[PDB]
């Protein structure tokens, strides 16, 4: 059901593990069927598992890891800081991100907001 | 005006510096006169500079520092991870937090959401 603070920590860490391996299908199954993603926050949301899948598939050798603990609330929400390492034209680079997520009463991500801009990118 | 991504980074870092010294009056002046604070996120908002001042004064020897970079957007918002160190009955302890902030068209914090629970506290 609606995850506890403890369960939020586990779910958000699991999310980063699945990014890190690049398991698109498993990432999509963490989202509600009609979830929204704003990535980066400030840009229009994308809606639904098909669009979210399209986003991860195009976005995702990528490494990703937590760069500090998951901060969880008691209302099925949390925020986490992490870093994603990638290649963008033979050039390695990294991006520092904070995701904010709200989970639904089934334990699926209902909304995700990914905070980052160009100021968080490093070559 | 509405801060740029760069200006958000500076403003959010300045906020942590002012927490760290414990300058209640300077912290309150960063907020809009009618700002809201949800701290921890999940709890009812407090509204306005008088209530916000009351919150910082009661909350704030405290140390506070960024534990990674400020993630800023292009719509006057950002998120940052940090740690606050304190004493709570002669016992030192620490709290890991992510704040999410939205700035107004004047550069003042209009809303702040502080993500953390008991799972982020350490004795
Ligand atoms: O959640 C994510 C990722 F998993 C990868 C890049 C950005 C982002 F916001
Ligand atoms: O913004 C803050 C602080 F400045 C201190 C403790 C918690 C918090 F959310």
UniProtKB/Swiss-Prot annotation, chains A, B:
Domain of life: Bacteria
Binding site for substrate: 99
Inducing factors: By steroids.
Substitution effect: residue 123 to A: Slightly reduces activity and reduces protein stability
An MF annotation (GO) of this entry: steroid Delta-isomerase activity
GO biological process: steroid metabolic process
Active-site residues from the entry: 15, 39
CDD domains: ketosteroid_isomerase (cd00781)
Catalyzed reactions per annotation: a 3-oxo-Delta(5)-steroid = a 3-oxo-Delta(4)-steroid
Keyword set, alphabetical order: Isomerase, Lipid metabolism, Steroid metabolism
InterPro entries on file: Ketosteroid_isomerase (IPR039256), NTF2-like_dom_sf (IPR032710), SnoaL-like (IPR037401)
Entry's EC annotation: 5.3.3.1
The keyword Lipid metabolism is assigned to this record: yes
Effect seen on changing residue 88 to A: Slightly reduces activity. Reduces protein stability
Pfam families: SnoaL_2
Signal sequence region: none
Subunit-level organization: Homodimer.
Name of this chain's protein: Steroid Delta-isomerase
Organism per entry: Pseudomonas putida
């Amino acid at each position: 059901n609606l995850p506890t603070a403890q369960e939020v920590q586990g779910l958000m860490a699991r999310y980063i593990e699945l990014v890190d391996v690049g398991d698109i299908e498993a990432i999509v199954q963490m989202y509600a069927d009609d979830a929204t993603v704003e990535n980066p926050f400030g840009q229009p949301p994308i809606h639904g598992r098909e669009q979210i899948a399209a986003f991860y598939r195009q976005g995702l050798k990528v490494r990703a890891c937590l760069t500090g603990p998951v901060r969880a609330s008691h209302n099925g929400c949390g925020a986490m800081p992490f870093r994603v390492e990638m290649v963008w034209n033979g050039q390695p680079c990294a991006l520092d991100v904070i995701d904010v997520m709200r989970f639904d009463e089934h334990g699926r991500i209902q909304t995700m907001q990914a905070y980052w801009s160009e100021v968080n990118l490093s070559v």
